[PDB]
Design a protein around this nucleic acid. Structure first.
Ligand SMILES: Cc1cn([C@H]2C=C[C@@H](COP(=O)(O)OP(=O)(O)OP(=O)(O)O)O2)c(=O)[nH]c1=O
Ligand SMILES: [Mg+2]
Ligand SMILES: [Mg+2]
Lengths: 557, 394
DNA sequence: GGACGGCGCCCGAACAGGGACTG
DNA sequence: GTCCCTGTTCGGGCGCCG
């Protein structure tokens, strides 16, 4: 039947008209499927034959469903979608099994022909004109418009989600302590009732929906565990993901890689240890989906470890609100991290991975802080509160970093976990100049026209060095000068620079950079015992800065 | 009967995505919106309204009630378009009179622009959308349109106390007097009784640039000092670094001890005096935004400058909690931002655009757990160069 | 095969600043 | 102004769901 709910008014974008697009040729099988669907829908008033007063048309096709018996009628409304008003999407996210609470009784059920039960605004119906091509030479082709929501229109998901929320509002008010997770037309229904009373309430709900025109065919009314829901299997006390099949190709294209990375990201929600850094880097600067990229050895090994991880059996548990939420973070290399969220020690609620590279230069404490942030907003979405953390970082390390760092940074209630690799700072700049360490005055200059430059230093003990550079920049010459002072100094060095660029980088204590030259600097800094970095304004005649400025400006400025 | 309101020409409405809320806030918002709907103040809407403004809730300190807070910053940016004696009163209290706005209808053609969406835990349901039927709290136009009724309600209290200063900024009455705090609180309760129908701005102080005192100076010390004065000369053209810099000719070790000449000693005392005088030639322009910059100084100290053009500071200040065994940088930054906004509202009746020395993500993750005001200033995030931190250091 | 919306991830393109240059 | 360097946003693939 068709819902007696009020329609949602919609409009074309201003100054625009309905689509005029030729039906394309479909196979005969799809034409029979469409014909059966269409004459049945026409009998039920879901579609209406139209005449030549309607000038519009847009192509139509069909695909098999999850149930491979039944067909699904679709409409390529890409034109009309372009010309249709904007909507505000109401589906803000995706429900997650780890957020479900234990329930005495559970039912999953699906609405039959969901879209085709929700009326479409009358004023807009004419733009949905479509044509079923002739199945014969002796039979011509019927033209229809839609009276209900069509699949392929950009307004259908939101209008259906909103209509469903309205339809379920009365039942929810009357039944506040029965929980109905509503994913488009999938309903997970949970109660704390004994199975009999629960089934009675479910019948109430089915009849409530039927009064509003939505059927719940028994074919999709799951009554016994394990429940199949949102890509998972729900058992009474544990959940799992429906199995992941990684491809086993020998030649790999960009598209093959995107498929692999997508399935691994899906799997990491419950499998600990998934890593995609190398596989993902493989996609850099690629041309198009067809480009074959050859696996690096690093990516080869990564994929091997992931395949092994996937051969293991794993599950999640449901949420108990009367216990704390605990997230535990584990480091892997390359700015990669995994996490486990749980309430009792070896019973994960879920797992995950953080790997995103933020910024040209960074270190492991920064990365850990942003992994904490990601997990915190994920926890607020799924459980509505913040978890308690267990991090591989010593309280003194955090303390030191939060002292030395000029930015506001913070991490909620947490506790040190002694599972290496521990997060550390790999060097520490001095706060005061160092007695007995030689003092270097460094500078660089670069000619913006020819891109030739010079880096170099003078020391208070009389050493002087100038190094010439080709195809460089001012910022790069400054970095090279600092690198040179580090190479030629002892285990303890005072360095003076005029470049607040270089000072801002080095002061934030990076241990990774996408710049080779900053990596080389970082390596040097780890080899040292004491480094002190002072700043002076450039071009003011100050101290040793003047001598080195005159040295490096010589053939370049 | 309603007052028509339009948007600034060539501007569509707000389209800001709602951010995730904790369970406490969602429950509060759902109950508050339920009541608001029974009373006709808001109406459910669908997805055919394409506009959206985020929403959240604050539980005020030791108050068992919550308060909804709509983040109307974008809408206010897009809506069509001061008592100088308030900054001087001995004491000033701030009342929340947003409630009044629910008594005035809102122009129908405008209502769609106030859409907002309640989210759900673990995405159990699609979001649930509302729009306003009355003057919304935190909207630029609510005080503008209610102004006349406000003046009418306040005329007698202002007559019977012409020594009390009352100022309205959007959801807030600022009430200032020169009374003993007991009599001041009694007068405030008089005003709250009449309305059924603690700040001390005279003690806010300026944080001046300040130079080190030493009996022994190293090359390092003098290099830091010359850099700091070179910077400060852009705010004070009196500053000069000729002689102090002269002390550094050659290529010296950073820890070599340098004796200060007579000339350099004079220059240093002069500069020390120049930094006493206030910044000359800085006039507040209301048609430009106030810029606030904050620098974390460590150990619970924070420094701030309010200016409108670079180096022309209207005010400079510091906020200083006590050193932290269990200190929270984000909570402190939020407190600093609310204090500074309060001061800017009192002095100039306008909020600053803040440049915040924090990551976008950290701030957005946590700031609403410490917000306690009914307005929200505009902000952007920066990666501060620790130079300026050294410059304004105390 | 292919149409739609949601969230996730990852990369690159097109911006938006702020600092340092040339004579 | 210009060139550099760095940050954010958005759009395009894919995963998953209906
Ligand atoms: C899976 C899917 C779905 N939809 C829309 C339409 C129906 C609702 C619900 O999907 P569905 O339950 O599988 O199809 P439905 O039309 O209800 O048909 P049946 O449930 O009766 O088989 O989402 C879509 O537009 N494209 C899709 O690929
Ligand atoms: Mg269905
Ligand atoms: Mg230089």
């Amino acid at each position: 039947p068709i819902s007696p709910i009020e329609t949602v008014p919609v409009k074309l974008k201003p100054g625009m008209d309905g689509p005029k697009v030729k039906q394309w040729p479909l196979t005969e099988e799809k034409i029979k499927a469409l014909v059966e669907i269409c004459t049945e829908m026409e009998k039920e008033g879901k579609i209406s034959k139209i005449g030549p007063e309607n000038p519009y048309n847009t192509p139509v096709f069909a695909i098999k469903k999850k149930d491979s018996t039944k067909w699904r009628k679709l409409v390529d409304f890409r034109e009309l979608n372009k010309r249709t008003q904007d909507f505000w999407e109401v589906q803000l996210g995706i429900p997650h099994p780890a957020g479900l609470k234990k329930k005495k009784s559970v039912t999953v059920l699906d609405v039959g022909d969901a879209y085709f039960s929700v009326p479409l605004d009358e004023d807009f119906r004419k733009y949905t004109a479509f044509t079923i091509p002739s199945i014969n030479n002796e039979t011509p082709g019927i033209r229809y418009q839609y009276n209900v929501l069509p699949q392929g229109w950009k307004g259908s998901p939101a209008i259906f989600q909103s209509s469903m929320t309205k339809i379920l509002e009365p039942f929810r008010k009357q039944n506040p302590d029965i929980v109905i997770y509503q994913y488009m037309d999938d309903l997970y229904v949970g109660s704390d009732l004994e199975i009999g009373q629960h089934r009675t309430k479910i019948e109430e709900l089915r009849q409530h929906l039927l009064r509003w025109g939505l059927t719940t065919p028994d074919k999709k009314h799951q009554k016994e565990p394990p429940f199949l829901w949102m890509g998972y299997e729900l058992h009474p006390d544990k959940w799992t993901v429906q199995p992941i099949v990684l491809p086993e190709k020998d030649s790999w294209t960009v598209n093959d890689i995107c498929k692999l990375v997508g399935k691994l990201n899906w799997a990491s929600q419950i499998y600990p240890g998934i890593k995609v850094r190398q596989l993902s880097k493989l996609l850099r600067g690629t041309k198009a989906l067809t480009e074959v990229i050859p696996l690096t050895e690093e990516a080869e090994l990564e994929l091997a470890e992931n395949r092994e991880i996937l051969k293991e059996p794993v599950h999640g548990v449901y949420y108990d609100p009367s216990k704390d939420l605990i997230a535990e973070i584990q480091k892997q290399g390359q700015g990669q991290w995994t996490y486990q969220i749980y309430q009792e020690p070896f019973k994960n609620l879920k797992t995950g991975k953080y790997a995103r590279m933020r910024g040209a230069h960074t270190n492991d404490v920064k990365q850990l802080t942003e992994a904490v942030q990601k997990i915190t907003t994920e926890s607020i979405v799924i459980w509505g509160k913040t978890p308690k953390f267990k991090l591989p970082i010593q309280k003194e390390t955090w303390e030191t970093w939060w002292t030395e760092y000029w930015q506001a940074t913070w991490i909620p209630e947490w506790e040190f976990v002694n599972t290496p690799p521990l997060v550390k700072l790999w060097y520490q700049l001095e706060k005061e100049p160092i007695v007995g360490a030689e003092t270097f005055y460094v500078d660089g200059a670069a000619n913006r026209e020819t891109k030739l430059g010079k880096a170099g230093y003078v020391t208070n003990r009389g050493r002087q060095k100038v190094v010439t550079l080709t195809d460089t920049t001012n910022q790069k010459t400054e970095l090279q000068a600092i690198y040179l002072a580090l190479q030629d100094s002892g285990l303890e060095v005072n360095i003076v620079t005029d470049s607040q660029y270089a000072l801002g980088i080095i002061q934030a204590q990076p241990d990774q950079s996408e710049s080779e030259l900053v990596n080389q600097i970082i390596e040097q800094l780890i080899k040292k015992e004491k480094v002190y970095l002072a700043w002076v304004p450039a071009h003011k005649g100050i101290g040793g800065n003047e001598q080195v400025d005159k040295l490096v400006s010589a053939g370049i400025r | 009967e309603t007052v028509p309101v339009k948007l600034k020409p060539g501007m569509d409405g707000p389209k800001v995505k709602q951010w995730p809320l904790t369970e406490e806030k969602i429950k509060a918002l759902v109950e508050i919106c339920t009541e608001m709907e029974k009373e006709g103040k808001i109406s459910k809407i669908g997805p055919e309204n394409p506009y959206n403004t985020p929403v959240f809730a604050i539980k005020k300190k030791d108050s068992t009630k919550w308060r909804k807070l709509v983040d109307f910053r974008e809408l206010n940016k897009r809506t069509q378009d001061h008592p100088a004696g308030l900054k001087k009163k001995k004491s000033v209290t701030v009342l929340d009179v947003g409630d009044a706005y629910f008594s005035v209808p809102l122009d129908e053609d405008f209502r769609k622009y106030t859409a907002f969406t309640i989210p759900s835990i673990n995405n159990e349901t699609p979001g649930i959308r509302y729009q306003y039927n009355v003057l919304p709290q935190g909207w630029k136009g609510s005080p503008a349109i209610f102004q006349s009724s406000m003046t009418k309600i306040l005329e007698p209290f202002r007559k019977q106390n012409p020594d009390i200063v009352i100022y309205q900024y959007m959801d807030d009455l600022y009430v200032g007097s020169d009374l003993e705090i007991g009599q001041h609180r009694t007068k405030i309760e008089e005003l709250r009784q009449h309305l059924l129908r603690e700040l001390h701005p005279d003690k806010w102080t300026v944080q001046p640039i300040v130079l080190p005192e030493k009996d022994s100076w190293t090359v390092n010390d003098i290099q830091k000092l010359v850099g700091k004065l070179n910077w400060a000369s852009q705010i004070y053209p009196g500053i000069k670094v000729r002689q102090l810099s002269k002390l550094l000719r050659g290529t010296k070790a950073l820890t070599e001890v340098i004796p200060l000449t007579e000339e350099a000693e004079l220059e240093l005392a002069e500069n020390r005096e120049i930094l006493k005088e206030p910044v000359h030639g800085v006039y507040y322009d209301p048609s430009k935004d106030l810029i606030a910059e904050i620098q974390k100084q460590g150990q619970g100290q924070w420094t701030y400058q309010i200016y409108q053009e670079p180096f022309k500071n209207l005010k400079t200040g510091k906020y200083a909690r006590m050193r932290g065994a269990h200190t929270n940088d984000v909570k402190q930054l939020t407190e600093a931002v609310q204090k500074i906004t309060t001061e800017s509202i009192v002095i100039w009746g306008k909020t600053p655009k803040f440049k915040l020395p924090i990551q976008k993500e950290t701030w957005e993750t946590w700031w609403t757990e410490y917000w306690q005001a009914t307005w929200i200033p505009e902000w952007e995030f920066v990666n501060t160069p620790p130079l300026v931190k050294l410059w304004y250091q105390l």
